[PDB]
Amino acid sequence: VQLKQSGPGLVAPSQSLSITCTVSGFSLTSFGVHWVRQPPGKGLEWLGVIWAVGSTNYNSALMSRLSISKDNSKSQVFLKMNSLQIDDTAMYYCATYGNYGGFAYWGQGTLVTVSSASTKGPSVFPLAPSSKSTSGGTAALGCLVKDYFPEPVTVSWNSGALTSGVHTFPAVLQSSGLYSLSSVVTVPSSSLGTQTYICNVNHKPSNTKVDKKVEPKS
Amino acid sequence: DIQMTQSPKSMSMSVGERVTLSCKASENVHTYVSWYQQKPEQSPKLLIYGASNRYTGVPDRFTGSGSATDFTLTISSVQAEDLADYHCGQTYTYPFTFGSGTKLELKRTVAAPSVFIFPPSDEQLKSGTASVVCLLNNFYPREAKVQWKVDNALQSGNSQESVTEQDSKDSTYSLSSTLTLSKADYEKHKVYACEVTHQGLSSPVTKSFNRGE
Ligand SMILES: CC(=O)N[C@H]1[C@H]([C@H](O)[C@H](O)CO)O[C@@](O[C@H]2[C@@H](O)[C@@H](CO)O[C@@H](O[C@H]3[C@H](O)[C@@H](O)[C@H](SCC(=N)NCCCC[C@H](NC(C)=O)C(N)=O)O[C@@H]3CO)[C@@H]2O)(C(=O)O)C[C@@H]1O
Ligand SMILES: [Zn+2]
Ligand SMILES: [Zn+2]
Ligand SMILES: [Zn+2]
């Protein structure tokens, strides 16, 4: 069983969003698919369901602006919402009970931001290791991911080969209205000249992909 | 309509202790209650459905109970891997609704932060801005204070900070604070310092660099 959703992105207030959920491992003629959303640091909210038989039920608070449809032969379910409000900003999930009594299977989520701002890819700067980022045999280095919008960004190190000791911090909203975040990793201080460390940034809303080598300075 | 109330909002337990999470319904929802686990950067995962049925692959230490309006999730002996937000939901009647979530964190021994400082990159300085980053790595408990100083002047209003969720491997936090100046202002001063207060430190610790070194 798998549910895969379309990508995250920005939409303007008063306009409309669309999300596609592509399912595999089960048939839409036997199982209903629901939509649920989670505003960024809050709880879950159920939006509605299209049942296997094709009828729908919606959250009464939203039903005037919500539509769920599906294409059985393409194993696709569609969410549409219009007259968007700023507080429609949320992580949107497709899910199904499957054969269970709760939401047993979930899509990976689609982060939808409702705003009149621009989409902007980030600048990526090194946080260079030095004497001032070393504590005995352990050194810290990182990368600053600055001035992007909307959320989210993905950060990996050495394309994901390096995961131990990585801390990617929650982004902060700067006074400019753009996000900034850091990602750091700690490594043996003796390794700083002997290993290549690259931060990989992916900003899907803009298709910005940047690789930044992080080296000691002189 | 049906409001689900989870309590407490947060709790802190030592490893090996039994954890109890509470969820209350504003109307009788019989046994149509589920519990979900959610870790950072992950979708929710089903733990319990039908109030008491453990979902596939869920460890035996997780148990659900209750009926009508009072529901409980217990973790018999909590482990590091259980740090997460926990959500309850009712599917008894439309619209289906969820609680607001309970955050579970772990207690451990006090641990002082390692403090690191990073000057702005040359590439950023070319563009007209300077970000200075102070990193507090692997500390416990979460409460900490970061004070920026520029040529001994205490700064206010020009920094932002962010804290990670508690780490499953060692139960610590880390914190990053960014001080932002224009290139023009950055070039005017020599000393940039962050001073850190934490209960694991005898006295506040300072980490600094000098723009002319
Ligand atoms: C493999 C299989 O058997 N597939 C089924 C699927 C499958 O079971 C589901 O998709 C889940 O994955 O279900 C199919 O049937 C659907 C469909 O028939 C729709 C039509 O609306 O109904 C679905 O059932 C839901 C009920 O509509 C909904 O009311 C209940 S709420 C939970 C409950 N049991 N409450 C009891 C009291 C109700 C509230 C009460 N209201 C009154 C008394 O009026 C009150 N006092 O408030 O949830 C049901 C789902 O759990 C049904 O599952 C499908 O998808 O088409 C058939 C397919 O064969
Ligand atoms: Zn760490
Ligand atoms: Zn009953
Ligand atoms: Zn100045």
Side-chain angles (χ1 to χ4, degrees):
Chain A
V1 173
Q2 200 176 70
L3 298 95
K4 286 280 77 191
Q5 307 181 212
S6 41
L10 188 47
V11 293
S14 91
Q15 295 298 68
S16 80
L17 68 83
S18 272
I19 313 184
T20 300
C21 182
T22 305
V23 311
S24 51
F26 74 99
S27 152
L28 291 175
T29 54
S30 296
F31 295 93
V33 175
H34 313 233
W35 292 92
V36 179
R37 69 181 182 188
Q38 189 176 26
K42 282 199 272 158
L44 300 154
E45 181 176 22
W46 177 86
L47 309 175
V49 58
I50 185 155
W51 295 112
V53 72
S55 58
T56 53
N57 297 93
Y58 299 111
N59 189 318
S60 43
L62 304 180
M63 156 177 46
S64 64
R65 336 185 266 121
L66 209 45
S67 167
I68 295 160
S69 60
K70 69 172 172 162
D71 187 344
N72 283 329
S73 62
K74 304 200 133 144
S75 312
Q76 289 175 330
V77 180
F78 307 101
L79 175 66
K80 314 211 182 93
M81 190 174 338
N82 58 20
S83 318
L84 285 175
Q85 317 171 4
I86 300 284
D87 61 274
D88 291 325
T89 292
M91 183 77 62
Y92 285 77
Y93 294 97
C94 58
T96 180
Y97 294 169
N99 289 315
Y100 302 93
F103 294 113
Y105 294 96
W106 296 67
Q108 87 274 21
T110 299
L111 189 52
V112 183
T113 303
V114 182
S115 158
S116 311
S118 323
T119 300
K120 178 174 180 324
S123 298
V124 183
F125 304 111
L127 298 164
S130 73
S131 302
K132 310 282 184 165
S133 80
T134 310
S135 163
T138 313
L141 61 136
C143 65
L144 181 67
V145 181
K146 201 169 175 305
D147 296 332
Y148 66 91
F149 194 85
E151 286 258 69
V153 291
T154 295
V155 182
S156 63
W157 285 88
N158 292 346
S159 296
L162 171 57
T163 54
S164 319
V166 177
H167 292 295
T168 301
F169 290 91
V172 297
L173 195 47
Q174 310 169 97
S175 48
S176 64
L178 308 164
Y179 283 100
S180 171
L181 65 65
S182 60
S183 177
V184 302
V185 58
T186 50
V187 297
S189 46
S190 81
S191 82
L192 290 176
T194 78
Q195 310 290 306
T196 291
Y197 298 113
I198 314 274
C199 70
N200 324 100
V201 177
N202 186 9
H203 183 240
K204 290 189 175 213
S206 74
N207 198 33
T208 296
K209 279 170 312 168
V210 181
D211 302 314
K212 201 66 175 217
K213 181 159 202 233
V214 181
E215 265 175 291
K217 203 205 212 192
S218 290
Chain B
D1 52 321
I2 300 192
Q3 296 182 327
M4 308 293 287
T5 307
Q6 285 183 253
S7 52
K9 288 279 163 164
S10 53
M11 46 165 48
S12 188
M13 310 298 296
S14 322
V15 176
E17 294 183 351
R18 191 216 204 200
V19 173
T20 300
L21 300 185
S22 157
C23 178
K24 304 133 261 181
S26 62
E27 303 182 37
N28 194 327
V29 298
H30 299 272
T31 55
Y32 297 96
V33 165
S34 296
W35 290 88
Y36 304 88
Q37 186 186 62
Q38 189 173 28
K39 295 194 180 183
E41 270 168 30
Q42 294 182 13
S43 311
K45 303 187 171 44
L46 181 65
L47 295 170
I48 304 294
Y49 60 96
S52 64
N53 295 283
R54 188 178 297 115
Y55 181 62
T56 312
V58 169
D60 293 327
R61 61 179 180 275
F62 294 87
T63 298
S65 56
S67 57
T69 64
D70 295 281
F71 302 83
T72 297
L73 176 68
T74 63
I75 310 165
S76 61
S77 169
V78 60
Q79 307 181 1
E81 81 216 101
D82 301 338
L83 297 166
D85 297 328
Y86 291 84
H87 301 272
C88 67
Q90 68 89 14
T91 49
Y92 172 68
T93 197
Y94 300 115
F96 304 147
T97 51
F98 298 87
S100 57
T102 289
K103 185 179 289 296
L104 179 61
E105 297 181 290
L106 287 177
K107 285 194 237 272
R108 61 151 287 160
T109 51
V110 179
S114 301
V115 185
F116 306 110
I117 188 162
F118 298 96
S121 66
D122 269 0
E123 39 256 81
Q124 189 191 22
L125 285 176
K126 253 193 179 216
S127 77
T129 304
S131 308
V132 191
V133 178
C134 183
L135 171 61
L136 285 53
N137 214 27
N138 299 341
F139 60 95
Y140 185 90
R142 177 193 235 264
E143 302 76 71
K145 177 152 282 196
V146 174
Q147 172 71 249
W148 285 99
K149 305 193 181 146
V150 180
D151 284 340
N152 296 340
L154 288 182
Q155 304 290 295
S156 203
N158 49 5
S159 63
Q160 297 185 281
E161 77 184 26
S162 165
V163 191
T164 57
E165 305 273 29
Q166 193 172 28
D167 190 311
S168 47
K169 289 332 120 186
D170 58 20
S171 289
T172 64
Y173 302 91
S174 293
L175 180 150
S176 159
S177 173
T178 303
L179 171 79
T180 309
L181 305 193
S182 61
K183 181 192 165 99
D185 287 335
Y186 180 70
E187 269 179 356
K188 282 167 192 309
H189 308 286
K190 293 286 193 192
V191 178
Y192 292 83
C194 60
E195 175 166 65
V196 171
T197 304
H198 186 260
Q199 101 168 62
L201 301 166
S202 50
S203 49
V205 172
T206 295
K207 207 71 177 187
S208 78
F209 66 89
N210 190 304
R211 232 205 60 231
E213 90 189 313

